[PDB]
């Protein structure tokens, strides 16, 4: 036992054991002689869940009595990962459960590995929602997460012949012990139909109804006895040839069947639009119901805050208007005032292909009334623009919520800005770019709406839970208070010259690496050298994230070794992992290239154990918890101006890895906090990128001037990495040479040079560790508690509280 895991009291352990046996018997209907590890996992899960119940019921009862302003976080993604360990940590039950299971003859880690990840998200945006829920509970806010209970989350990735294969993520197969179905709270959602204009107001009729059934999952705060709720909706068909009619119910229920895995290119698919309205319509009725139980909607914004995670739930704006105007009978102007003061929008990217632009004909058929409301919103908004900038007809077309052209579309981002009192970017540089480029016109019209809220990650899951060894040595010296006040890590700077601490920091990292190296062999049968530098790049596969630039460096290292075999080089294990969206051809070709490189490099006798290339299969939250604590070097190399913020970068910094990256997204603030001397910065800044675009990017120039780069391209073209299929990577070479929107070649030279400096420092164990200490010590700003406290104070208008609850 380690301290930060709580106390293992005698009667506490005694109680856990009897309840464990009680659940195995009564709940699982099992007996010790036939129970399997999975059965034991569920017994433990139900045992821990029991401890949540009392707190969950009184927290909600408390909000009913106090009636504080309620925060509603709307998102179509909640990348939760596993729940068991996180629950024990927040309830201070980890050591007790560890002891209790030990006495029962069971290994708790083994049991924890049985839980399926709740992968209801694609990557950053979904995981941000998850960290936010944790921080909002830890800060005592009356917050509710609202989304969709997908029967199938992000697909499980299988690598066959070096290619990605997608497999259904049937995460509910064995059941979900954490959720509680609330069929009694089912609500109706309407689709299609037509709008009738009677004497007194518009009426939406002849609609098809789909029921929204909620499932509640508890969200425990960190040791403050606060347990908030994450409510996820499931689609159900109303009960009203016979056989075919029953079988056709599936049509309606398909709405909550699966998570769309396309995080790169917006697809105007009808099913996706249905999902977006489904979550919005059910959620708003729930919100209003709770409000009416606290008819003067003037106080609505004082009791309700709705945060839109990107434009995915943007229909909340016209839906709130529909309800207030059509159902509650408020006049337009009043309803609009309430709507704007209630809603706030968060943008996550400036890349055009990711922005939602719904075809008018789709909204016309599916949501006829909302389209009319959107047109009216646009009309009134443009009248305001026309009055502020008389005669500027071009601005009018640019700011319109309706885009003209081949097919008319609705720009959901413009809709969100017009209908929100606050719009924020997720990193200082990103928020600035929003004001200077993409949303410049809106900023000039309403400057007060634009804010910045730099992202963060929760130190519970991303430190205490996944790196107990590091959390312990830190606590030994500054206490446990930093876990909910991460800024305290700064006190660690006074230990940068402490020989003992330096030794412990390095020991923990070594232990994490051996632990991960072992895992690689157990569950994947691959052998790596634990003494090599762990060079890691894990995140979804995208051209802008430039996994390709990493590949070029790897090949360069390989070619240099083959050039001078007996020359010493710092050993490296290069790990790249991440999923590619199913229809993203280039991303899939990049995964293939990575494995192809490994096939050559990992079997070259001359290389030995000096260089290894491994593709981490099925990267997901639970895998991130294993690899991040074991990393030495974090690759954050997106083209300057493309990664809005990034969050994986923060996870690595908090866990003892140094960072090599561009001045993009949050990397800028990270370097600023730790000091540029303690970061491995390289490449073009946003300004350099622009200037290059003015001139015109010509990749051929770099190819002609850099011999090493030329050699790599020729190897790719000639089939050096694909003997049986010589032209296998022709698409990659053609993209790099003629239409690379992300300028991979432009940063190649500086990148390779920077990597040499990384290797130089790694050769000096003591100085590498001292730099690590300086990074960990200054990672405090990146806690989602800080992010949430800012949202609370500057956007929602509520004060966070660290005050514990009762028992």
Ligand X SMILES: *Cc1c(COP(=O)(O)O)cnc(C)c1O
Ligand Y SMILES: Nc1ccc(C(=O)NC(=O)N[C@@H]2O[C@H](CO)[C@@H](O)[C@H](O)[C@H]2O)cc1
Ligand Z SMILES: O=c1[nH]cnc2c1ncn2[C@@H]1O[C@H](COP(=O)(O)O)[C@@H](O)[C@H]1O
Q: Which of residues 613-632 bind ligand X (CB under 6 A)?
A: 620-621, 624
The question of whether 572 is a catalytic residue gets the answer no
- The residues near 137 (Cβ < 8 Å, ≥ 6 apart) are 143, 219, 220, 221, 222, 224, 226, 227, 228
Choosing among ligand X, ligand Y, a second copy, none, which partner's interface includes residue 620 (Cβ < 5 to 8 Å by kind)? ligand X
The binding site for ligand Y (CB under 6 A) comprises 122-126, 128, 263, 266, 348-349, 354, 426, 455, 643-647, 665
- The DSSP H or E segment spanning 156 is strand 156-160
Q: Smallest gap, in angstroms, from Cβ of residue 211 to a second copy?
A: 10
Q: DSSP letter string over 447-501?
A: GGGEEE----B-TIIIIIIT-HHHHHHHHHHH-SGGGG-GGGGGGGGGGTT-HHH
Q: Is 294 annotated as a binding residue?
A: yes
Cβ(471)–Cβ(654) under 8 Å?
Answer: no
Binding-site member from 1, 54, 64, 188 for ligand Z (CB under 6 A): 64
The question of whether 421 is a catalytic residue gets the answer no
Q: Smallest gap, in angstroms, from Cβ of residue 610 to ligand Y?
A: 34
Half-sphere exposure of 500 (CA within 13 A, CB side): 7
Place of tokens 């003992």: 500
Cβ(419)–Cβ(338) under 8 Å?
Answer: no
CA distance 332 to 366: 23
The question of whether 14 is a catalytic residue gets the answer no
Choosing among ligand Z, ligand X, ligand Y, none, which partner's interface includes residue 349 (Cβ < 5 to 8 Å by kind)? ligand Y
Residues belonging to the chain: 807
Return the number of the residue (127 or 322) whose C-beta is nearest ligand X.
127
The question of whether 158 is a catalytic residue gets the answer no
Please, what is the Cα angle at 88 between 466 and 657, to 5 degrees? 10
Q: Tell me the residue number closest to ligand Z, measured at CB.
A: 64
Q: Provide the mask over 261-300, with x wherever binding to ligand Z is found by CB under 6 A and - wherever it is not.
A: -----------------------------x--x-------
Other beta carbons less than 10 A from residue 675's beta carbon = 12
Is residue 717 a contact residue for ligand Z (CB under 6 A)?
A: no
Return the number of the residue (142 or 371) whose C-beta is nearest ligand Z.
142
Which phi and psi angles does 539 have, rounded to 5°? Answer: 170, 165
Choosing among ligand X, ligand Z, a second copy, none, which partner's interface includes residue 184 (Cβ < 5 to 8 Å by kind)? a second copy
In b/e form, how buried is each residue of 269-284, taking b as 16+ CB within 10 angstroms? eeebbbbbbbbbbbbb
Strands (E), 617-706: 633-636, 658-661, 680-681
Binding-site member from 10, 11, 33, 499 for ligand Z (CB under 6 A): 33
Choice among 274, 579, 651, 743 that is catalytic: 651
> Could you say which DSSP state residue 733 is in?
H
Q: Smallest gap, in angstroms, from Cβ of residue 228 to ligand Y?
A: 21
Is residue 783 a contact residue for ligand X (CB under 6 A)?
A: no
Q: Which of residues 642-661 bind ligand X (CB under 6 A)?
A: 646-648, 651
CA distance 13 to 101: 9
Q: Is 50 annotated as a binding residue?
A: no
Return the number of the residue (218 or 313) whose C-beta is nearest ligand Y.
313
Choice among 647, 659, 662, 787 that is catalytic: 647
Cβ(719)–Cβ(793) under 8 Å?
Answer: no
- The DSSP H or E segment spanning 711 is helix 707-718
The question of whether 787 is a catalytic residue gets the answer no
Nearest CA-CA partner of 87 in 44, 148, 119: 44
CA distance 736 to 703: 10
The token duo for 445 is: 């019209």
Binding-site member from 46, 509, 539, 743 for ligand X (CB under 6 A): 539
The question of whether 545 is a catalytic residue gets the answer yes
Q: Smallest gap, in angstroms, from Cβ of residue 236 to a second copy?
A: 8
The binding site for a second copy (CB under 8 A) comprises 25-26, 29-31, 36, 38, 50, 53-54, 56-57, 61, 152, 155-156, 166-168, 170, 173-175, 180-181, 183-184, 236-237, 239-243, 245-247, 249-250, 254, 257-258, 260-261, 269, 271, 582-583
Q: Which residues participate in the annotated binding site for AMP?
A: 31, 64, 289-294
Could you list the residues that contact ligand X (CB under 6 A)? 123-124, 127, 539, 620-621, 624, 646-648, 651
Catalytic sites, residue numbers = 348, 539-540, 545, 647, 651
Could you list the residues that contact ligand Z (CB under 6 A)? 31, 33-34, 60-61, 64, 290, 293
């Amino acid at each position: 036992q380690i301290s930060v895991r709580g106390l293992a009291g005698v009667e506490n352990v005694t109680e856990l054991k009897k309840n464990f046996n009680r659940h195995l018997h009564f709940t699982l209907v099992k007996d010790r002689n036939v129970a399997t590890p999975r059965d034991y996992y569920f017994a433990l899960a139900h045992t821990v869940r029991d401890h949540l119940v009392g707190r969950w019921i009184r927290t909600q009862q408390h909000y009913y009595e106090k009636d504080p302003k309620r925060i509603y976080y709307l998102s179509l993604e909640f990348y939760m990962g596993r729940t068991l360990q996180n629950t024990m940590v927040n309830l201070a039950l980890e050591n007790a459960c560890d002891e209790a299971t030990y006495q029962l003859g069971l290994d708790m880690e083994e049991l924890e590995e049985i839980e399926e990840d709740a992968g209801l998200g694609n990557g950053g945006l979904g995981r941000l929602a998850a960290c936010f829920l944790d921080s909002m509970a830890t800060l005592g806010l009356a917050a509710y997460g609202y989304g969709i209970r997908y029967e199938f989350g992000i697909f499980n990735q299988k690598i066959c012949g070096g290619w990605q294969m997608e497999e259904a993520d049937d995460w509910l197969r064995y059941g979900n012990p954490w959720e509680k179905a609330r069929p009694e709270f089912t609500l109706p959602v309407h689709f299609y139909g037509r709008v009738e204009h009677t004497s007194q107001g518009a009426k939406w009729v002849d609609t098809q109804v789909v029921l929204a059934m909620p499932y509640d999952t508890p969200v425990p705060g960190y040791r403050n006895n606060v347990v908030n709720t994450m409510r996820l909706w499931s689609a159900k068909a109303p009960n009203d040839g016979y056989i075919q009619a029953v079988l056709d119910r599936n049509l309606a229920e398909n709405i909550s069947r699966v998570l769309y895995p396309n995080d790169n290119f917006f697809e105007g698919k009808e099913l996706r639009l249905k999902q977006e309205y489904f979550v919005v319509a059910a959620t708003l009725q729930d919100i209003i119901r709770r409000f009416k139980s606290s008819t003067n909607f003037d106080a609505f914004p004082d009791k309700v805050a709705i945060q839109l995670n990107d434009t995915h739930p943007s229909l909340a704006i016209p839906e709130l208007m529909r309800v207030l105007v059509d159902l509650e009978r408020l006049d337009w102007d009043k309803a609009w005032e309430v709507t704007v003061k209630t809603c706030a929008y968060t943008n996550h990217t400036v890349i055009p292909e990711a922005l939602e632009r719904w075809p008018v004909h789709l909204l016309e058929t599916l949501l006829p009334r909302h389209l009319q409301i959107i047109y009216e919103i646009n009309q009134r908004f443009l009248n305001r623009v026309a009055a502020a900038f008389p005669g500027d007809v071009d601005r009018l077309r640019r700011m319109s919520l309706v885009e003209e052209g081949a097919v008319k579309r609705i720009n959901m981002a413009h809709l969100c800005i017009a209908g929100s009192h606050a719009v924020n970017g997720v990193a200082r540089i990103h928020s600035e770019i929003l004001k200077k480029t993409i949303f410049k016109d809106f900023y000039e019209l309403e400057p007060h709406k634009f804010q910045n809220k730099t992202n963060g990650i929760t130190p519970r899951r991303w430190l205490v839970l996944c790196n107990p060894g590091l959390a312990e040595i830190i606590a030994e010296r500054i206490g446990e208070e930093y876990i909910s006040d991460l800024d305290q890590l700064r006190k660690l700077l006074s230990y940068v010259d402490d020989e003992a601490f330096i030794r412990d920091v390095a020991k923990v990292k070594q232990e994490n690496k051996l632990k991960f190296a072992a895992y690689l062999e157990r569950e994947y049968k691959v052998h790596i050298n634990p003494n090599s530098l762990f060079d890691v790049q894990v995140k979804r596969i995208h051209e802008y994230k430039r996994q390709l630039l990493n590949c070029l460096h790897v090949i360069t290292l390989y070619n240099r070794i083959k050039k001078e075999p007996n020359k010493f080089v710092v050993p490296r294990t290069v790990m790249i992992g991440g999923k590619a969206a199913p229809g993203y051809h280039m991303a899939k070709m990049i995964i293939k290239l990575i494995t192809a490189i490994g096939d050559v490099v990992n079997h070259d006798p001359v290389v030995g154990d000096r260089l290894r290339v491994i593709f981490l299969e099925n990267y997901r939250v639970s895998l991130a918890e294993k690899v991040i604590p074991a990393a030495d070097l974090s690759e954050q190399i997106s083209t300057a101006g493309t990664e809005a913020s990034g969050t994986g970068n923060m996870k690595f910094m908090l866990n003892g890895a140094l960072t090599i990256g561009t001045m993009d997204g949050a990397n800028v603030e990270m370097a600023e906090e730790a000091g540029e001397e303690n970061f491995f910065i390289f490449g073009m800044r946003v300004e350099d990128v622009d200037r290059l675009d003015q001139r015109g990017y010509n990749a051929q120039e770099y190819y002609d001037r850099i011999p090493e780069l030329r050699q790599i391209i020729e190897q790719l073209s000639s089939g050096f990495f694909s003997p049986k299929q010589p032209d296998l990577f022709k698409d990659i070479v053609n993209m790099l040479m003629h239409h690379d929107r992300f300028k991979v070649f432009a940063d190649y030279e500086e990148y390779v040079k920077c990597q040499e400096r990384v290797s130089a420092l790694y050769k000096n164990p003591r100085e590498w560790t001292r730099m690590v200490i300086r990074n960990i010590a200054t990672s405090g700003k990146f806690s989602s508690d800080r992010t949430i406290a800012q949202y609370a104070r500057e956007i929602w208008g509520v004060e966070p509280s660290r005050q514990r609850l009762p028992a």
